[PDB]
Amino acid sequence: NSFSGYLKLTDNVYIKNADIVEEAKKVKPTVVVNAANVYLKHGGGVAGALNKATNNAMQVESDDYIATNGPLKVGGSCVLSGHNLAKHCLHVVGPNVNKGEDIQLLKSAYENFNQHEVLLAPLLSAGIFGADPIHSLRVCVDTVRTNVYLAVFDKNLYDKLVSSFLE
Ligand SMILES: CC(C)[C@H](Nc1ncnc2[nH]cnc12)c1ccc2c(c1)S(=O)(=O)CCC2
To answer: Where do the Macro domain residues begin and end?
Structure first.
């Protein structure tokens, strides 16, 4: 859990302008969070980048999890292997508001982080899931009580997040 160059926002939330894949390789955290969908199909975005970095091992394991257990619910999670990126991957499903899913489930999604002492995570429901990223950071700060290191791979969004939080 050798995190470097993060800005501490609150006693338990830290943020960095960085690609979560590059962070996982440098840090080898105990837990990396994937911004998953309910069938664990890692077709693009953050999930696609994490799966590519495992040379598709994450997708094969995920398909075998879904066959045996069925899909996740929106707001839910499962713990699978971290492969070469971490000890464990916490696959968390935030709501996709661009597909009509309820934004209130973002609180449920961040509540899954509280079962793990330290996590490397992306900003849930941001990007093409359509949530307002400043709202997602506020939900994270108000909900997560364990130690979370957010990697946001966009300097423009990183700067807007830090400015809106420190105002
Ligand atoms: C908002 C961007 C900058 C961020 N991308 C990334 N953030 C951190 N490490 C990365 N590596 C490659 N991409 C990123 C991000 C945050 C959450 C989500 C998405 C994208 S999405 O569009 O894949 C849909 C799932 C939710």
So the answer is: 1-167
Q: Which residue has the tokens 């955290």?
A: 29
Way it was determined: X-ray
Domain CATH for 109 = 3.40.220.10
Structural domain including 34 reads: 1-165
In angstroms, the CA 127 to CA 125 distance is 7
Number of domains comprising the chain: 1
- What resolution in angstrom units was achieved for this structure? 1.2
Q: How many CA atoms lie within 13 A of 25 on its CB side?
A: 9
Do residues 82 and 32 touch, judged by C-beta distance below 8 A? yes
Cα-atom radius of gyration of the chain, to the nearest Å? 15
What's the CA-to-centroid distance between 124 and ligand 1, angstroms?
Answer: 8
